[PDB]
Amino acid sequence: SNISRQAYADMFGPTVGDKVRLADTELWIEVEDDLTTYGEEVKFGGGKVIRDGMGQGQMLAADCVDLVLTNALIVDHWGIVKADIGVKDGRIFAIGKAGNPDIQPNVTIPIGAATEVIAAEGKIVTAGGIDTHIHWICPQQAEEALVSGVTTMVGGGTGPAAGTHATTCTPGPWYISRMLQAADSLPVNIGLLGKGNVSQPDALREQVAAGVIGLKIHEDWGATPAAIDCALTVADEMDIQVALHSDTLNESGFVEDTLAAIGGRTIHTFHTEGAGGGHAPDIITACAHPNILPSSTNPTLPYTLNTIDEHLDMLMVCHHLDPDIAEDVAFAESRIRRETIAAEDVLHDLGAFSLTSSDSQAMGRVGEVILRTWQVAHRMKVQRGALAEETGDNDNFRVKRYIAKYTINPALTHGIAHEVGSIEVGKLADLVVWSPAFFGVKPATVIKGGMIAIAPMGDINASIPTPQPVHYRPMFGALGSARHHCRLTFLSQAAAANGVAERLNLRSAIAVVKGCRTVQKADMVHNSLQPNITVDAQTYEVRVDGELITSEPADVLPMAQRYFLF
Amino acid sequence: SNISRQAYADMFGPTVGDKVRLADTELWIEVEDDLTTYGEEVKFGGGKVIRDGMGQGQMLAADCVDLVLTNALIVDHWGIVKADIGVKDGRIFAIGKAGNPDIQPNVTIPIGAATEVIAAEGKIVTAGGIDTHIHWICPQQAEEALVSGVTTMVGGGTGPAAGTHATTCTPGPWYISRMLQAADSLPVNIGLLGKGNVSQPDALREQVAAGVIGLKIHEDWGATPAAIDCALTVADEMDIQVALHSDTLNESGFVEDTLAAIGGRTIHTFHTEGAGGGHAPDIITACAHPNILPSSTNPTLPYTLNTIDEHLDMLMVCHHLDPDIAEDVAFAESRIRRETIAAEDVLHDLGAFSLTSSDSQAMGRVGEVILRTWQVAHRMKVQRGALAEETGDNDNFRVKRYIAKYTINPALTHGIAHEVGSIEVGKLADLVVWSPAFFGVKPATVIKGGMIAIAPMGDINASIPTPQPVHYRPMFGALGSARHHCRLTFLSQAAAANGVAERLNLRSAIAVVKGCRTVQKADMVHNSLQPNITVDAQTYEVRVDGELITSEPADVLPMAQRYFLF
Amino acid sequence: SNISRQAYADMFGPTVGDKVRLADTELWIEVEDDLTTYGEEVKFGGGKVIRDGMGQGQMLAADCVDLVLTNALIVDHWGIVKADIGVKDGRIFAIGKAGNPDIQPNVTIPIGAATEVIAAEGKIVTAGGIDTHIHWICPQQAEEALVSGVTTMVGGGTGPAAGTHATTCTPGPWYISRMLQAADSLPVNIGLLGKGNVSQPDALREQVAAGVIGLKIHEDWGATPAAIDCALTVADEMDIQVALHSDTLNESGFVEDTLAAIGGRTIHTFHTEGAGGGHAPDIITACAHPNILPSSTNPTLPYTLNTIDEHLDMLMVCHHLDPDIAEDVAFAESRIRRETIAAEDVLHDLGAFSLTSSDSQAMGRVGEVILRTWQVAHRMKVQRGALAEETGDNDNFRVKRYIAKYTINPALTHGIAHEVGSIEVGKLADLVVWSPAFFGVKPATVIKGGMIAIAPMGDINASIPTPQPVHYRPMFGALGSARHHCRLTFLSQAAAANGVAERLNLRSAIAVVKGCRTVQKADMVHNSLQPNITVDAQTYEVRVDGELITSEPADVLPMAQRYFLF
Amino acid sequence: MELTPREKDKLLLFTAALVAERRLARGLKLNYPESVALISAFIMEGARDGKSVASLMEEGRHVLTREQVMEGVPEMIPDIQVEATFPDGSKLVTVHNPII
Amino acid sequence: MELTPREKDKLLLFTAALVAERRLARGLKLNYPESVALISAFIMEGARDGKSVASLMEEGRHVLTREQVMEGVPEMIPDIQVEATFPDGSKLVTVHNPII
Amino acid sequence: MIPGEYHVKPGQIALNTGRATCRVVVENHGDRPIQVGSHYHFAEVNPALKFDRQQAAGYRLNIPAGTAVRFEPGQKREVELVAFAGHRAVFGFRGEVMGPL
Ligand SMILES: [Mn+2]
Ligand SMILES: [Mn+2]
Ligand SMILES: [Mn+2]
Ligand SMILES: [Mn+2]
Ligand SMILES: [Mn+2]
Ligand SMILES: [Mn+2]
Secondary structure (H helix, E strand, O other): EEEEHHHHHHHHHOOOEEEEEEOOOOOOOOOOEOOOOOOOOOOOOOOOOEEEEOOHHHHHHOOOEEEEEEEEEEEEEEEEEEEEEEEEEOOOEEOEEEEEEOOOOOEEOOOOOOOOEEEEOOOOOEEEEEEEEEEEEOHHHHHHHHHHHEEEEEEEOOOOOOOHHHHHOOHHHHHHHHHHHHHHHHEEEEEEEEOOOOOOOOHHHHHHHHHHOEEOOOOOOOOHHHHHHHHHHHHHOOHHHEEEEEEOOOOOOOOOHHHHHHOOEHHHHHHOOOOOOOOOHHHHHHHHHHEEEEEEEEEHHOOOOOOHHHHHHHHHHOOOOOOHHHHHHHHOOOOOHHHHHHHHHHHHOOOOOOOEEEOOOOOOOOOOOOHHHHHHHHHHHHHHHHOOOOOOOOOOOHHHHHHHHHHHHHHOOOOOOOOOOOOOOOOEEOEEEEHHHHHHOOOEEEEEOOOEEEEEOOOOOOOOOOOOOOEEEEEEEHHHHHHHHEEEEEEEHHHHOOOHHHHHHHHHHHEEOOOOOOOEEEEEEEOOOOEEEEEEEOOEEEOOEEEEOEEEEEEOOOOOOOOOOO | OOHHHHHHHHOOOHOOEEEEEOOOOOOOOOOOOOOOOOOOOOOOOOOOOOEEOOEEEEOHHHHHOOOOEEEEEEEOOOOOEEEEEEEOOOEEEEOOOEEEEEEEEOOOOOOOOEEEEEEEOOEEEEEEEEEEEEEEEEHHHHHHHHHEEEEEEEEEOOOHHHHHOOOOOOOHHHHHHHHHHHHHHOOOEEEEEEEEOOOOHHHHHHHHHHOOEEEEEEHHHHHOOHHHHHHHEEEEHHHHHEEEEEEOOOOOOOOOHHHHHOOOOOEEOOOOOOOOOOOOHHHHHHOOOOOEEEEEEEEHHOEEOOOOHHHHHHHHHHHHOOOOOOHHHHHHHOOOHHHHHHHHHHHHHHOOOOEEEEOOOOOOOOHHHHHHHHHHHHHHHHHHHOOOOOOOOOHHHHHHHHHHHHHHHHHHHHHOOOOOOOOOOEEEEEEEEEEEEHOOOOOOEEEEEEEEEEEOOOOOOOOOOOOOOOOOEEHHHHOHHHHHHOOOOEEOOOHHHHHHHHHHHOOOOEEOOOOOOOOOHHHHOOOOOOOOEEEEOOOOOOOEEEEEEEEEEEEEOOOOOOHHHH | OOOHHHHHHHOOOOOOOEEEEEEOOOEEEOEEEOOOOOOOOOOOOOOOOEEEOOOOOOOOHHHOOOOOEEEEEEEOOOOOEEEEEEEEEEEEEEEOOEOOOEEEEEEOEEEOOOOEEEEOOOOOEOOOOEEEEEEEEEEEEEEEHHHOOOOEEEEEOOOOOOOHHHHHOHHHHHHHHHHHHOOOOHEEEEOOOEEEEOOOOHHHHHHHHHHHOOOEEHHHHOOOOOHHHHHHHHHHOOEEEEEEEEOOOOOOHHHHHHHHHHHHEEEEEOOOOOOOOOOOOOOOHHHHHHOEEEEEHHOOOOOEEHHHHHHHHHHHHHHHOOOOOOHHHHHHHHOOOOHHHEEEEEHHEEEEEEOOEEEOOOOOOOHHHHHHHHHHHHHHHHHOOOOOOOOOOOOHHHHHHHHHHHHHHHHHOOOOOOOOOOOOOEEOOOEEEHHHHHHHOOOOOEOOOEOOOEEEOOOOOOOOOOOOEEEEEEEEHHEEEEHHHHHHEEOHHHHHHHHHOOOOOOOOEEEEOOOOOOOHHHHHOOOOOOOEEEEEEOOEEEEEOOEEEOOOOOOOOOOOOOOOOO | EOOHHHHHHHHHHHHHHHHHHHHOOOOOOHHHHHHHHHHHHHHHHHHHHOHHHHHHHHHHHOOHHHHHHOOOHHOOOEEEEEEEEEEEOEEEEEEOOOOO | EEHHHHHHHHHHHHHHHHHHHHHHHHHOHHHHHHHHHHHHHHHHHHHHHHHHHHHHHHHHHHOOOHHHEEHHHHOOOEEEEEEEEEEEEEEEEEEEEEOO | OOOOEEEOOOEEEOOOOOOEEEEEEEEEEEOOOEEEEEEOHHHHHHOOEEEEOOOOOEEEOOOOOOEEEEEEEOOOOEEEEEEOOOOOEEEEOOOOOOOHH
C-alpha cells in the first residue's frame, strides 16, 4: 500500500535520505542507500514476516545463513547504508536483502530453519574496534575494551611489572608462550608484540619464531639507531610490524637521525604527537613521511581544559621517573606541549594522523578509544565546519574518515586486515550493534566470531531481560570452548610454520599476519595526507605549509557526563 | 535405654508420626516410615558414632559408599521417609541404614575410610529440579537456577538475540554445536531444543543429528499445521520430544485444527493455560487429551492480586510487539484472561496440568519454579482443603503430587528419566538439602553428580564457615574438570551415534534421551487427570463436566517477603 | 662519584647497615650484605640503566634470565641481604648482580632482550607461604590465601560437608580424583591428605595410590592407637606424611599412650597447644620428642584479650557438638586453657613449636597465617626482649626463626622442600614482593611459578594502574593454561608411578613428595628445641625445666586496625 | 542471610541509587544512569511497603521531573522496569515515560 | 543503566567511602583504607559538580588532617589518585600529600 | 538537542509496487477472533474465514511487512491482496499447495 516516512522509520529504521544524530554530538549521518525492496522487509516477532513458508524458507543449513541482522544501518569506511547482514560459519556472509526466495524478490541472504535472528532495525551496526597499543598489565582490560566495542587487541606485556607498565613488550620465548596460552581465556582477538630493543638479530628472530606479530622499540629499553635498524631488518625478513616510541631525550640524535635510521622502511609510530613519548619537541613531523603509519594515544584526544594539568603526574608514574630528580622532571615537562596537543586534533581531521589507540594504563584509557575519536570529530566539526570532501548536508565523509581510524587502518597497519577490520564478506563476524542515543558510548550488542560475547543484561530472575539493574554481563560467546571457537590468536608466519600452536596446545582459531612491510601512508583509508609540517624548536608551534595549525580546548564534551554514573 | 520423642527429634531429626511445616506455608508433612534401628543411628562429630571400628568399617573403597547423607527426611513422589542415603560413583547407591556391618545390625549402606559424610539430620532431602522451558538468553541463568534447587535445564537459545528472547530455539548445526560446547562451562545438566518450524524434514533431521534432544514449535516462527505435522514426523522417527507454543492468532485455524494436525502423537504443550501463548482463548482445553503432556510457566502461578496488571507489558517486550500497532496490542490482551489464570491453579491441584516450568526471561522467572509450585499448593489447600486422595491428617499426597511436577514428570516427558528426576538407586546424585524453615526458598546444600556445586557460604577468612555475610558461592563441583565429571549433556541417539561428542570435543559426561514418543498423559506421576474441560468462547469461563472451575487471587503469599532482601 | 647514604636508599633501597621497620611492629631488620657493585646497579625506566648495549646485553634467551627483580631486599631463613634475583624457566635462577657482562663488572644474572623486569628497590622479597593445615571447605579459600602471600596449600576436604568442616580429609579414591582434577582451576600449589583413620592398611594404601601426599588422623573419625599405628605403617612404606589430631577425650588412653602408639616414628602434630584439639590438657608435651614436628593453628596466635571469650562457640560449630549436651560442652571447655594458650607464644619464640598454619574455617583463619606469626614475634620481643642468638642491635635472628615457620619448615615436614619453601636456586619461583609499610599484611606483588598471579590493581580504565579503587584482582598467572604451567599438584610417588596424572588428565605440572619419614625435630630450621616440658594435670600450668612458662594477653596489636577496612 | 545472586544484584541498583540521591540533594540535574537508579530504587521500596503494582506504575512517573534531569535524558528513558518482592511474590512494574 | 565494569568498580569506592564517612562522624581517627576512600570519593563528586582538575588537586589536601587519622597513616599516603567523568571527559586527579 | 534523534524527511513510501493485486470480501464465520499476517498465504488461512479462496491463490496481504489484519467473530470486510513473487512456490501453511503456483 503506502506508508508515511515517519511511521516507516519507527517500524523499520531510517531509510534513504533520513538523517540520524550520533549520540549527543553535532555529527549527523544520512542514509546513502537502502538495499531492501519496500514492502518486503523481514521482521521477527509474533505474527511477523520471518515464519515458515513466509520469510523463512525450506533450504538446508548449508544453503542459508546462521545469523541474520535485519534492517541494519551500517556505518563503515565504505558507506552508510541500510541493509540486512548475513553471517555464516562465524564470518560475514553477505550484505543484502534477507528472506525466502520462494515467495520474496531479490533475496540474497536466505533465511531458513537454521537461521537465528537479531533485530537491528533502528540500530547502527559497525565493525569491532581494533586497539594496536595495548599494555597487558591486567587481564581485566579485555572485558573493559570489549564492552566499549573493541574486538581485537594487539600489544605486549606480562602483567603488572615495571617493563609492562612502561612498554608494550612481551620479553622473550617463555613470556611469549605464557601470554599466548593465557590469551585463550580472553574474549578478544589477540596479537603479541615482543621487545625489539636489541642489536643482535637472532635475539629478535627467536621472539618472532616464538609467536609475536610485531616488535616494539621503546626508549626505556634504549631506542638507539642501532636497535631501530636491527628490528627493521628482522621485520623486513619475517613480515611483522614494528611499533616505535622514539628517543625523547635526543640522546642518540634528533628526530631526523631516527628518521634516517628507519631509512624509508615501513613502521608504526605510536603517539606521534609526542606527549606519550618521542623526540622532544618535533616527533610530530614524522606524519609527513610515506613509510610512517602514525597514530595517537587517547588521553590527548581531544584538546580540552584539563588535559595539561592532568598529564605531568601521569607521565611520572608510567615511566618510573622521579619527581625529585631534576632531569626526570625536566624531560617529563619537555614532553607536554599545548602547541602540539592542539595541532593533533586538526591533523586527525585532515587525515595526517591515521590511527587512534589507547596505550592502556600507561598514559591511555582502554575503554575510551572509540569514545574519544568521536569527541575529536565533534569538536572539529564545531571549530572547522565541513571538510572539503563533504557532499550533501551531512557529516558522512567525516564519519567514514574517523571510523576508519579504529577499524580498517589499524588492521592494515598490523597485517590482519584479511581477517578483521571492517564489515566485508569473508571477514570474521566481529560486529557491534548500537542504539543511536548511545553510539560510541555503550553498545546494545557486541558480537564476536558470530556469537554474542557481552551485552547489557537486566535482572537474571526477571520475566524479561529488561528490568533493572542493567549492566554488562558475559554471554555464551565468552564461555570456554565457544570462546575458543569465536576468537583468533594472531601468529607470525614463522611461528605458524614451527607448529607453535600445537606445541603450546593453543585452543583458539589461529590467524597469520601478512603484508606488514608493504603498507604505506597512502594505503590508510581516508587518512593518507602527508603534510609539509614543521615544528618550531623554541615556541613549539606546528605549521603546515607555513600556515599555523591549532585548535581551542573544550570545556564540555558529548558522550561524557550524560552517560556515566561516575 | 529410652529417650523422649522430642529430645530424639532434636538429636536425629523427626521420626515416624512427627509432622513438619514446610517453610511458612500451611502444608504439613508427616514421616511415613523410618528405616533406622533405634539406638543404632550414625552421627558424625567429635566422639560420635562414625569412627574407626565403630560406625566406620574396614572395607575397601569398592565395598563402601563415597558419600553418606545421615538421617535424611526424604520427600519424593514415592514417599516421605526418614533414612540414610548412600552415594557411590556419582550415583544414588542406596536408601537404607548406614554404618558398620561388623558391629551394627541391618546395615545396608556401609561406611568406610573412603566415605565422606554430610549430616542431614533435621533436614529435608529432595531430587534436583528440572526446568524444561529454558530460554538461553544469558549463561548467568544457570547459577540462578542451581541456587534455587534446579539441577537440570532443557531449552534453547543462542544468547540475547531476538529469536531467543521470544522462543526456546537453538537454530541449526552451527549454533547447536556452539551451545553444546559452551554447556561444558555450566554447573547444570543440559539439553538443547532446535527450531522445529519447517515443512522440510531434512532441515529438522540435521538439527537432531547435530545434537538437539527436542524441537520447539513456536508461533513466532510460524506454528502452522504443516510445520507441526513435519516436526512430529521427525520426532517419531528419532525419539525426541516436541514442545509446542501454538498459534494464538487462530491464523491457520483454531485449537481443534492444531489438535487435529498433532493427530494423537505425543507432544509437550508449553504454558497450556495460554497467557504465555497459545490459541486464544481455549488452548487450555488441550489438557483433556492423552497424547498431550501439559505444563505451566511460572508467572501465572499462583493467581494473585497483581498478576493481571503485570502481564500486559511483559507480553509486549518478550514477543517484540508494538504497543502503538493496534493488532499487536489486541492480540496481547486476548492472551490475558483472569478466567483461565484462576482455573490453572485448580487444574494443577487436580492433576490435569502435570508440569511446572519457568520460561526464563521470556514471561517466566528462572529461580521461582520450585517456590511458585509450593505457593500454588499452599493456596489450594487454603481454598479447597484436603484432596480426595489424602489419608491421615497431613498433606502428604498433595506434596507428592506437586513435587513430581518439577522433578519426575519433566524427566519422563523429555526422555531423561532414566538418568535423573528422582531419588532412586542408579540415578545421578543430583540432590538438594533443605532446612525446614527455608524449604523451597533457599537450599542448605545443592549436590551435583555426587559433589556439592553451590552452597551458602560465610566469611572465607572466618574461623568457621558460618559468620556473616552468608550468600551462595560456587563450590568444587562447579570447578573445571570436576564440573565436567559431575554434569551431563543430553544428546539425541543420532548425535551420539554420529560421534558428535568426539567431534566437538565435549568434556562432560554424555547421556542419551529415549522414550519421548511413548510417554502419555497417563504416565505422569500423580498428575494423569484428563478432564472433560470446556472454555466459553465469549466469557472465557472454564468448566469441567459443566461445573465452573475457579479460584480467588491471593493478597499475600508465603516464601516471599519473609525470606528476601529485595 | 659519591652519593649520601640517604639519597642512595631513596633511589636503590637500603644498603648494608641500614635498618627497616617491619610494618607497624617493633621488629627491625638490618641489611647484612649487599651483592651489588656501587655505581653499577641496574634500574629500569626512561633513560635508566637497563637499555640496549648498556644494562641489557646481546645474548640469546638461553643465555639470559626471563625475569629479573632488581635491587631486592631478601628476607629468608638464610639471610637478610640486598641483591638482584634472576628467574629462568619458572624457577629461581640466581641471587646476585644483574646486568650486561659486556660493559659491567661482576654480572652473574645476565639481562637480555628476553628479560622482563620487576623493580624491587625499596621492597622486601620473601618466599611464598605454605599452609599445611587446609580444610577444603570452599574454593574461594585459595584466592584469600594467595592474596595474603601463601603460594602452597596442603590439606583435605570435599567441600562444605560435615566431614570436611571438622577434619582435613579427602575420603577415598573418588573424592581424591575429583579434588585432584578441581585443583587445576586453583592458582596455588596443592597437595591432598586422605582419611587415615582405619585399622586395615589396604584402605589407606588405595588412597595413597589414588594421589594423597599424606594421611590425616582425626579424633572425629576415631584417633585410636590401632588407627594411628596403621597409618604410620603405610606412611613408612610409601613415604608420605601423617598429620595428627589426637584423642581429646582420653577415651583410648592419655597423651603418653598416643605417644607410645606412634613409637618414635615421624609425625606432624596439628595445633600442638591443644585448643584446636588433642589430649586434654597435655597434648602440648609432644613438642619435647624428636619424631614430632609440632605446629600451631592461628586463632590462638598471639595470646590476646579476646582469645578465650571467642573460642567456646567456635569449638562447638566446627566439631558438630551440642551446647545442650553436657558431655559436648564439658569437652569443649576442657580444650580451652588460658595456661597453654599463653605458653604457646613463648614456646614459639624459643623454637619448641616449629610451624604455623591456619586450619581454614575449622578454628582457623586462612588469610592470617603470616600476619599472626609476625604479631607473635612482635609481642615476644616486647615481653621477652632479644633472643640469646641475636647479634648486633636488630631482630634479624628472630625474623629468620619466625619466617621459617611458614616457609621452609612446613616444606620440609611434608616432603616438598625440594620444590618450594625458600628462595634458593632451582626452586620454583613462588615469590612475594612487599612494601615495608605493609609487610606481612598486604603484598605489592604475588608471583607464582614465574608469573604474577595476583596484585593490587587500580582503575582498569585509568591512564595508569594506580588510581582508585585499588584492590586485589587476578592476573595472567591465574588464567587458564598459564595457570597450569605455573602451579604444581603434588602427588605421592605411588600415584605418580600409577600414571594418575595421565588417567585423570591433570593439566598442571606434577611434583612428587619424598623425605617425609626421615625428617625430625632437629631438621626444623631455627626451630629445633626439644624442651623438658611438663603440664600440671590440675592447674594446667606449663613448665620447662621446672621454670614456669607464660605471657600476658595483648590489648592492641600491629598489622590490625591500621590496615583493614573491616 | 543466604543471599541469592538476584538479591546481591539488587544491592547494586540500591547503591547506584544512593549516588543519585545524594547528587539530586545538592541540586544537580541528574544524568541517564542516575535517573534510572533513582526511580528504580523508588519502586523497589514501594513493593517492600506493600504498595500494589498499579499504584507504583503511577507514582513512578512523579519521582523526577523534566527540570531535574539533564537535556535529552527524558527521551532516553521511554519506560523503566524493575521487579521486587511484593507481599504476593515477585512482580514486574513498568513505568511508561517516567520523566515528564 | 547499562553499567560498564568501571562504573561498577567506582560503586565499590563509593561504598567504602560511606563506611569511613560514618566513622569520621562518630569522631574516630580514620585508618589507612578509610582515609583513601574518603578523599577519593570527595574528588569524584568534585568532578561531578564540574570542578576543574587544578581546583581539586588543591581541595583534596584539605579533606582530612593529621589529627583526624591514626598514627603513621599520613606517611602511608604520599599521594592519592582517582579518575572521574568531568564535563570534558575522564581526567586524572593526583593529590600530593593529601593529609597534613 | 535529543541524543540519537532522527530527522526523517517528510513524504511516503509506496509498498510492493508493480505487482498484481485484487480485493476480496472476507467474513469471519467463527466464534473466535482471527488475525492474519502480511506474508501468510491467504488461500490457506483459518477455514472459518469465508471468501473466494480460488482468487486468493498465491496471494498475501498488501499491508506493510510485519503488520496484521484482525477479524472479530462475525466481522466482514474487504481486503487487498498482492501476489507472491520470488519462485512463487508455496510450502507450509495448511499444506494445500506445497510447491510452485
Ligand atoms: Mn610509549
Ligand atoms: Mn605505551
Ligand atoms: Mn511460548
Ligand atoms: Mn518461551
Ligand atoms: Mn584438628
Ligand atoms: Mn583442622
